[PDB]
Paper text:
As the main antigen of influenza virus, the hemagglutinin (HA) from H3N2 viruses has five major antigenic sites (sites A–E). Several residues in antigenic site B of influenza HA are also part of the RBS, including residues 156, 158, 159, 190, 193, and 196. While the evolution of antigenic site B is driven by immune evasion, the indispensable function of the RBS imposes a strong functional constraint on its evolution (i.e., limiting the number of tolerable mutations). Structural analysis further reveals that the receptor-binding mode of the human H3N2 virus has itself evolved over time, providing a mechanistic basis for the evolution of the local fitness landscape of antigenic site B. This study provides insights into how antigenic site B is still able to continue evolving in the presence of the strong functional constraints that enable virus entry.
To elucidate the mechanism that underlies the evolution of the local fitness landscape of antigenic site B, we wanted to compare the receptor-binding mode of the original pandemic HK68 HA with that of a more recent HA (Bris07). Thus we determined HK68 HA in complex with 6′SLNLN at 2.25 Å resolution. By aligning their receptor-binding domains (HA1 residues 117–265), differences in the 6′SLNLN conformations can be observed. GlcNAc-3, Gal-4, and GlcNAc-5 are closer to the 190-helix when 6′SLNLN binds to Bris07 HA. In addition, there is a 90° rotation of GlcNAc-5 when 6′SLNLN binds to Bris07. Such conformational differences of 6′SLNLN can be attributed to the differences in the base of the HK68 HA RBS vs that of Bris07 HA RBS. As compared to HK68 HA RBS, Bris07 HA RBS has acquired several natural mutations at its base. For example, mutation G135T introduces a water-mediated hydrogen bond (H-bond) with Sia-1 O4 atom, whereas N137S introduces an H-bond with the Sia-1 carboxylate group. Moreover, mutations W222R and G225N enable H-bonds with Gal-2. Overall, this analysis demonstrates that natural mutations in the base of RBS can influence the conformation and mode of binding of the receptor.
Numbering used by the authors:
A (entry chain F), F (entry chain D): 1 to 171
B (entry chain E), E (entry chain C): 9 to 325
C (entry chain A): 9 to 329
D (entry chain B): 1 to 172
């Protein structure tokens, strides 16, 4: 994707994350754990549902039209009826092919984007207490218990509380 | 000591392939099908009024072929013509058959109003054993076969004004004898003529005498014509032989009615979209079942499948 | 100590909702309308040459209905037919009326060149009380009603070669009497025939005697036909009764000319695009005024409005009110 | 949008910024102030003007065509004439609907992008003298007068001049 | 003493301008053309079977104009009609010529099967000096000009059933004399009539006697008609003068065959796509050469060039 | 472009890089050098091949159609035949114009994206040993000979080896 996260600096997905599309895995003094991020999951879900509902926005209604199958050879008028119908079908098939291609490139790029937004959001939260390892993981330079991990995930992490402890470990 | 915090996304062990701008095949976690490619094989009888022609084409029901008499009081949103239908009355052709079939299908009714045409000096209600009714010879119910009375066939000259606020459809015909002997025996004059007119337009038909292939015992034929008379206009029919006269008119409507050729059976269910293969759901925007449709339908495309990605790129572990 | 530097973007008090790939309605700071949905109700008389038909259809002007004489030799980019038009000459039909109307409208001219046809042994210039010209009986100006001279109507066999380098459009007809008395009284022969042919094509029409609905005093009719003669071809007319003869040909052109049905008045203004509702501006790419258009026009669509975002997403400051 | 700035880590727009699309607000020892950024404003405006003029790239011209309204019932030929036009109108209506949706998604993304470019450009300027607060605001760890703020906005901010002062305030 | 590491991208001295959503002209490092706008000027004789009509229209080869005799039983994927073509037989017209030309062109064959029609009491093989075969007078090879035998022309009434499993195409005609002397001299009866019918269709043509403009010495004419007979159906021909009879039928096929007007010479090469200008390559998706095409062809568009970017934005040093 | 690298914070292209689309230039104690980055080049190249092959996804096949030029005036049937064809051509002409506009916008953005991805990847690699100068160049705060430069380019750069030396030079 355009943003280089999914199938990028994040090496692969987590087949074990079944309760959300994006999330966190951590290792600290208390062990390891996994948790999904609801907000990013919703942003991707919401946008994909939006485009899905625009695409399946209900169908046109047609009644009496032209004949499209013929049991006898007729020449000029029938040549035109078939050509009109064949022309219409080719233009709609092209539209369907292009629509799906554009939509699908965009769906991959927007989901890549939402992964990247969560990663940048997390790093800005951590300020000078962490460093980007390059694989989607942060090294957190201070003791971060399970409560401290939850504080990062639910957006209430006060970086100043650990800044002194973290700065001396970094430098 | 400290901690590690990894950001990530989900995956599934085996995704689904979609197409993009750059890839014919790229695997995502989920997708949904945009092309309806299957039918139940049955035409649902709701919400549209379905009329099964069974043994009858629409034209044969219009003319009043005796085995099609059951359709006289009928209306439809969709008339269904079966490949087993057959004609069983006087042998006939319709120049511009397709247009007559189309304008009747679109009107959606066979409602017929009898008018008192006065046919002075001719015998009415001719019939044939090629069009049996009960034990005797018969004819199309909506047509009136005129022949000589005594030894003369006068110039017929009748008029019918349209003083209603709806269009009138008149169906009429010309009889093409197989020999000169039947020509003069039926119509006295050696050459017939049928002129049907309104204020602004007219049709003139000359009958054709000659031998044709045997159909239900006969080498002769009838050619079918039609005339629409708008409110405030007037019909005039003028003939000195071979007229197959109208008995009245069909009331025309405008609306959503149509016709379809199909052998799919009719079933008790609900479906907005009808194809000759049967009803199809219309939740998807496209369909590959049949370019012939009726109702609120997905658009016909050539592809049998098109996947819309509903998830991210699938990167399994 | 220190300082704070905040990056931001503007917002406006009144955004507009637009459609996107993911949202049927999301708010941006500004947008612009892509569908032209109004007309003035008037057809601008420039830059296209507009010809108001007034009381006349194009066909009645072509044949030369007397109240349409004012249209002789006229030209147009757009002939405008009004719903008040009427015929006031011999009752007639044109088999394939729509094609004759279309090909004349596209040609854009009624320029008529009289030719010296020699009609030996017949009376010319027949007229009717159903087609008055002045106080007396008359006829379509461009047609020549031939009837018997003395007691005979000979087999007519006349020729008119095309020695010019342009195509000739010939308008001709066949007369349908209402009675056998009329047929023999006008044409001697009990049954007429009109054959008009070129080197590669021919048309033969047999008249039918009988009554049609009473129109302007007549139960009889005239049927109108046409023949195009290319350079190097020759028109041949063969008839032993019931011929309604041409007096010449119409010059044919190719260009931008057309025809439109409309009751909109014609005004002095400038507009490239014309609809039956009146002229419309063509600055927008789409329009919902009328699928019938003429000129440099936006494409007709079903939507009555389509907003193209011309600004960023409008994110107002949330309020406690 | 794809970049997460507008309606993202930037909480809202400024109705009081009336002279530009993107800009700066600051607080220092001399008070508060606001200034629009012309380059980012111009970049977004040029692109929107560009796509607007491509869309209205003037119209096709048609003269004699087919008839589209009919006063008589005719059958097969009239069925086809109506079907041809209805088919055309549906395809053009589809084109118009897809066009505005694609254009508008892209316009929201490109304006989002210009906000992000300006934000990243500013942060690179500040080097080690500031820290990103996460809401589009930088905390600047040294005394920065109006001249110093202006120097950031017009691209003439020499980070080396304040680097020592700012590094000691950041690390303790 | 440190180091510097600069990340960058390439550029080229002279890029190419392309169009985008926001820019009608912007420079990238490379692009490729999507509109085919040139032709070789020649029609490649592979992989499609090209049949050069030379001096003959398809219709003249069908009827059997003598200078077109070489086209007997020919087949084609694309029949090429040349502007130099001419007719050199009896002067004729085909009502709905365009439909006859189209349905034969699409069938792709002139395969003709002679059938044993019996024409009792008439003379066969009439000819004209306007249609010479060798030094003597002649006629269209596939038509049989019938005239009186001795002093009589009886009513012809003949039958030919279709007992095969394919459709038969019958070509027949009506002769229009220039004078009454020709009419009675050739057909005895003062007025002819031609009725050709199957079970489902019938056509009756009355000849028109009179002078038409001189063509190849003749003011008379022949009018050409056709009748298709499906399996199990029957052809009946009924006439008391002026019949131009068929000698058999043409086999009909369905497939990829067509016809094209072109003066491009035919060359020995391979090209899928054919225009009247000549063959064109089909590697590009669009083309501006001709809206008339045959084969696997790029779609016709109005633009003469459309550049697809194959590289990044070009930012020269 | 959307990412602001090509024709953005990177001032211009390198006409001298003929062996790749993206690459590195360095200055150190041993002099200057240039090297193309194959992975980023190939990522953009693979993508452009993908869309090029989709666009050249070969043409449809048509045989007998309708006539499109006419030698005689006929009126209604010919009006319709011409209108059908002219309608078709305008719709395909529009499809082509839109196709290249969308494709080319996307090609510029995806190549801009790949430039940005390489720059971000490098900065993550350098960790606390370098600073972004704002013009696409990193100032490297430690002795980095040719062996050290190639190690950055081939992804084997151990930041911890230089971290103490680099932190002391930065502060
Ligand atoms: C004193 C005097 O001269 N009076 C006149 C009467 O003679 C005359 O009646 C007719 O007289 C002649 C002899 O002069 C003859 O007897 C007529 O009888 C016909 O006979 C033929 C020979 O067998 C017979 O032909 C067969 O017909 C069938 C088809 O028949 C029907 C049908 O079912 O289609 C019978 C229908 O009643 C008839 N309908 C009408 C309205 O006429 C139709 C119709 O005529 C045809 O469909 C037209 O195409 O035909 C088949 O064709 C066989 O192959 C064939 O052998 C006829 O069926 C006999 N006709 C009748 C009506 O029975 C006799 O009628 C009288 C009227 O002409 O006028 C007096 O002045
Ligand atoms: C010595 C000798 O024999 N001389 C010959 C003449 O007799 C002969 O003239 C004709 O003779 C008969 C009797 O032999 C009769 O007198 C004819 O007079 C007609 O009379 C009827 C009844 O009054 C009248 O019919 C009415 O017509 C109107 C409308 O008619 C017009 C019209 O306005 O359309 C009048 C036009 O002049 C006329 N134009 C032409 C070119 O003929 C047209 C035209 O006839 C029709 O439109 C064709 O369809 O008709 C309305 O239809 C009423 O309902 C109807 O009763 C006719 O109008 C009288 N005829 C005329 C010409 O006025 C008389 O013609 C002569 C020619 O045959 O030859 C001598 O040698
Ligand atoms: C074939 O049948 C039709 C219908 O029966 C018949 O046509 C009719 O002819 C009468 C004349 O007898 C027409 O009556 C006219 O009606 C108009 C109103 O639209 C009146 O203006 C006319 O009145 C004036 O003219 C009369 C001349 O006879 C005077 O007597 C009268 O006092 C007025 O001055 C006129 O009465 C009628 O309109 C038509 N009907 C239709 C439907 O056309 C036709 O004549 C018959 N043909 C034959 C050969 O018998
Ligand atoms: C002009 O020629 C025509 C062709 O010869 C003549 O028509 C023929 O007329 C006879 C009697 O007049 C008909 O004989 C009848 O035939 C049926 C059988 O019908 C069908 O049955 C087989 C199926 O096995 C089918 O394949 C055939 O095509 C038959 O059509 C018999 O059962 C009856 O007894 C009856 O005698 C012919 O059927 C009929 N043929 C055709 C093709 O129309 C016509 O009479 C001649 N005209 C004149 C004026 O002489
Ligand atoms: C039988 C014959 O040759 N009779 C002489 C007439 O031909 C000749 O009149 C001239 O005839 C010219 C056309 O003649 C042919 C033709 O088309 O070449 C001759 C054919 O034998 C004849 N074929 C048949 C089957 O009858 C054919 C046919 O009658 C017509 O084509 C039917 O329309 O005509 C041409 O018309 C000249 O203009 C004409 O003068 C006369 C007098 O010269 O002498 C006859 O002996
Ligand atoms: C936001 O977009 C709207 C368009 O929907 C802009 O409104 C338009 O502003 C222009 C100003 O140049 C108006 O054009 C002018 O019209 C007058 C006559 O009305 C004419 O004499 C001038 O020469 C010029 O053409 C235009 O009418 C107007 N459109 C509407 C629908 O109001 C608006 O300016 C945009 N706002 C911003 C801040 O960009
Ligand atoms: C009806 O009138 C037309 C025109 O007057 C007559 O047709 C003409 O017939 C003559 C026959 O003598 C044709 O002349 C021929 O011309 C060639 C050279 O073109 C000459 O070499 C021959 O010797 C011969 O004389 C003339 O071309 C022809 N005109 C046209 C336009 O075809 C016709 O005969 C008349 N018919 C009746 C029944 O009155
Ligand atoms: C392939 O063949 C077609 C048709 O044979 C060519 O189209 C023709 O192109 C010429 C000029 O390119 C047109 O000439 C016209 O001349 C008049 C008078 O000067 C002028 O008013 C027109 O604007 C036009 O230039 C000709 O009309 C046109 N014919 C058709 C049916 O479109 C086509 O150019 C050929 N392409 C190649 C690559 O050879
Ligand atoms: C894959 O995507 C489709 C489309 O979003 C999901 O199908 C929807 O499922 C919900 C129930 O979970 C239904 O209410 C909707 O009607 C379905 N939509 C369609 C278009 O069918 C599907 O559940 C997704 N699968 C997974 C595993 O996430
Ligand atoms: C729906 O019915 C149509 C028409 O019968 C089917 O199309 C035919 O399919 C057969 C078998 O594949 C082909 O031999 C014919 O050439 C097809 N005819 C036409 C006119 O296309 C179609 O496959 C059916 N589809 C479904 C899903 O039932
Ligand atoms: C332009 O004129 C057309 C008709 O010529 C208007 O559309 C019609 O509006 C009437 C209103 O009673 C409807 O009954 C018809 O069904 C409409 N016809 C069609 C073809 O849609 C149209 O609204 C006019 N537009 C403007 C802006 O005046
Ligand atoms: C049509 O309706 C009438 C009276 O309403 C009824 O008597 C007649 O039987 C009906 N015909 C059919 C075919 O049902
Ligand atoms: C029409 O034009 C022709 C040729 O220009 C001319 O001879 C004729 O007199 C004109 N007629 C009128 C009524 O202006
Ligand atoms: C453009 O196309 C190909 C590269 O894919 C190559 O043959 C040609 O040299 C390229 N031109 C430039 C200027 O890069
Ligand atoms: C034409 O058709 C068949 C061969 O398919 C054969 O009966 C006949 O002789 C063939 N004639 C020629 C000239 O090929
Ligand atoms: C990477 O670079 C180092 C030093 O510059 C070199 O020795 C080595 O061979 C390269 N490749 C790998 C896989 O280490």
């Amino acid at each position: 994707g355009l943003f280089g996260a999914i199938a990028g600096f994040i090496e692969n997905g987590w087949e074990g994350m079944i309760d959300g599309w994006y999330g966190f895995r951590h290792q600290n003094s208390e062990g390891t754990g996994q948790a999904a991020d609801l907000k990013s999951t919703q942003a991707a879900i919401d946008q994909i549902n939006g485009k899905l509902n625009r695409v399946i926005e209900k169908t046109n209604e047609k009644f009496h039209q032209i004949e499209k199958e013929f049991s006898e050879v007729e020449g000029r008028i029938q040549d035109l009826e078939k050509y009109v119908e064949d022309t219409k079908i080719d233009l709609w098939s092209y539209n369907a092919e292009l629509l799906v291609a554009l939509e699908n490139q965009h769906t991959i790029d927007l989901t890549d984007s939402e992964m990247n937004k969560l990663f940048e959001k997390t790093g800005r939260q951590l300020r000078e207490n962490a460093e980007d390892m390059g694989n989607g993981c942060f090294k957190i330079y201070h003791k971060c218990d399970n409560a401290c991990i939850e504080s990062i995930r639910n957006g209430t992490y006060d970086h100043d509380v650990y800044r002194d402890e973290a700065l001396n470990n970094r430098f | 000591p400290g901690a590690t915090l990894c950001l990530g996304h989900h995956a599934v062990p085996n995704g689904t392939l979609v197409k993009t701008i750059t890839d014919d095949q790229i695997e995502v976690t989920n997708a949904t099908e945009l092309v309806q490619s299957s039918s139940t094989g049955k035409i649902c009888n709701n919400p549209h009024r379905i009329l099964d022609g069974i043994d009858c084409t629409l034209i044969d029901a219009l003319l009043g072929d005796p085995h099609c008499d059951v359709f006289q009081n009928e209306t439809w949103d969709l008339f269904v013509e079966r490949s087993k239908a057959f004609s069983n009355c006087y042998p006939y052709d319709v120049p511009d058959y397709a247009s007559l079939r189309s304008l009747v299908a679109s009107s959606g009714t066979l409602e017929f109003i009898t008018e008192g045409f006065t046919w002075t000096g001719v015998t009415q209600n001719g019939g044939s054993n090629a069009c049996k009714r009960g034990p005797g010879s018969g004819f199309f119910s909506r047509l009136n076969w005129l022949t000589k009375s005594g030894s003369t066939y006068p110039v017929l000259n009748v008029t019918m004004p349209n003083n209603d606020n709806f269009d009138k459809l008149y169906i009429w015909g010309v009889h093409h004898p197989s020999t000169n002997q039947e020509q003069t025996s039926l119509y006295v004059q050696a050459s017939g003529r049928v002129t049907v007119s309104t204020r602004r337009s007219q049709q003139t038909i000359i009958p054709n005498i000659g031998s044709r292939p045997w159909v239900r015992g006969l080498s002769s034929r009838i050619s079918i014509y039609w005339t629409i008379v708008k409110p405030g206009d007037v019909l005039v029919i003028n003939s000195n032989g071979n007229l197959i006269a109208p008995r009245g008119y069909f009331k025309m409507r405008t609306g959503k009615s149509s016709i379809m050729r199909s052998d799919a059976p009719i079933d008790t269910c609900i479906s907005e979209c009808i194809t000759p293969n049967g009803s199809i759901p219309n939740d998807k925007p496209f369909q590959n079942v049949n370019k012939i449709t009726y109702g609120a339908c997905p658009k016909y495309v050539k592809q049998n499948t098109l996947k819309l990605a509903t998830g991210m790129r699938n990167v399994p572990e």
